[PDB]
Design a protein around this ligand. Sequence first.
Ligand code: JUG
Ligand code: JUG
Ligand code: JUG
Ligand code: CL
Ligand code: ZN
Length: 472
Amino acid sequence: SPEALLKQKLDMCSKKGDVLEALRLYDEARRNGVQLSQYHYNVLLYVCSLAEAATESSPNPGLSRGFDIFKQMIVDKVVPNEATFTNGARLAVAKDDPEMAFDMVKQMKAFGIQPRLRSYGPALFGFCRKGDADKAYEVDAHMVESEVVPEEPELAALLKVSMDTKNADKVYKTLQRLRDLVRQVSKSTFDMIEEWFKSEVATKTGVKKWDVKKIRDAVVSGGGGWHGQGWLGTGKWNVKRTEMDENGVCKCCKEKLVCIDINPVETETFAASLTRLACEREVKANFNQFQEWLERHGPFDAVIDGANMGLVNQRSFSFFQLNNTVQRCQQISPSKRLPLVILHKSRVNATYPKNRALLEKWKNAGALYATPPGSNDDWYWLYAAVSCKCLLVTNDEMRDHLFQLLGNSFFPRWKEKHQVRISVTREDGLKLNMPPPYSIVIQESEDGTWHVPMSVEDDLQTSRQWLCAKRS
Ligand SMILES: O=C1C=CC(=O)c2c(O)cccc21
Ligand SMILES: O=C1C=CC(=O)c2c(O)cccc21
Ligand SMILES: O=C1C=CC(=O)c2c(O)cccc21
Ligand SMILES: [Cl-]
Ligand SMILES: [Zn+2]
């Protein structure tokens, strides 16, 4: 067919890197009357984005036509898919015209298409480089109306543009957004927040009289750990890099941070999403069978990721480390409940006979579920800990794609409250590291003192740095 030739020839044009040939083949198809489908359009947008814009004379027809091709795709009502948005975005990034990036997003919306987060990036980061705060806030308002949630890079851009234009109101609001959506901040956002609090504008914003009643009312109302009523106090901020002790006490100022509740209704929603997500990947009958088993067992104070407890920091599966963990979890259980061990059936059948007999004893005591061949254990230990409302014992770093499906609002908060990690020393052996008695999140106290935590990969490996910003 003629459409299958365009497909065949554009495939090679990208793989060569010839944009001029892809643009010739584009026009030939219009002069031949051949309709372009999803696939054809995506390859052109990608191919066009291999071009750069000229430092000397007007930009090259690869990028210029790229946007025209995109505009035409939308006009034609060719359905965009995830490769469309990626390509249109990398076209916008190479072009580096924030104004034109923002047009694509406006077209998408005009034609009933839901823009992606990566669509907004070129516009937002361009306007930020340029210092055009008003345009950045336009892009932001457009995301909000499109219900596309920013992540940390977009929020940091918004923060920095707000700092650049002395807009203390936007700094405040953006800081609350970081609290709400990100919780702990990257190193570059952390440095940026420190600069804000040390700056003249920050020194010069505030109020020395305020209604203590309305603040306290706002603290109750927000769920705790913030009030949202604006900057309080006056004068220079004391801004110190510091740490929290194990009880959430700031080492600089002695403020004890608060522990923020989780709403049990959000937990039930999450439980249902786990079930849905798991059923999509596991054999449905396997996950059902586990849920039915779980309904007939328990109660549990803890759930163990048995593969991770056998393997973390080991050359091969350590039954010693699994068993030591089981024993320690049982010892801290107020009634000495055995923890529920989730482990692959292949690993249940350990080749030292007393260990195999113990694994079978645990099963017989209602405290071991052997997951079937082909299963991903993670769904099982997550579903169990969530549903049994108990501790989850795993050092899984949660780098896997699976965990990205769980979202970045509820699940990180839940994890903080439920996750136990093991650590081992030469001197002392194995230790359980329990959930902290405070929430590791940006906090704003009732007198307007701020504590801002840095994000780290593992906070047992890394001593987590915090900012303490307190009026002098
Ligand atoms: O000042 C900047 C504001 C936003 C932004 O994205 C940016 C950047 O990406 C590189 C240098 C400076 C800035
Ligand atoms: O949609 C489902 C996927 C898995 C699963 O176990 C399940 C279930 O157990 C009950 C209703 C729906 C589902
Ligand atoms: O006292 C606690 C405050 C917060 C919190 O998350 C917590 C916890 O997760 C386990 C025991 C005590 C606390
Ligand atoms: Cl033995
Ligand atoms: Zn402090």
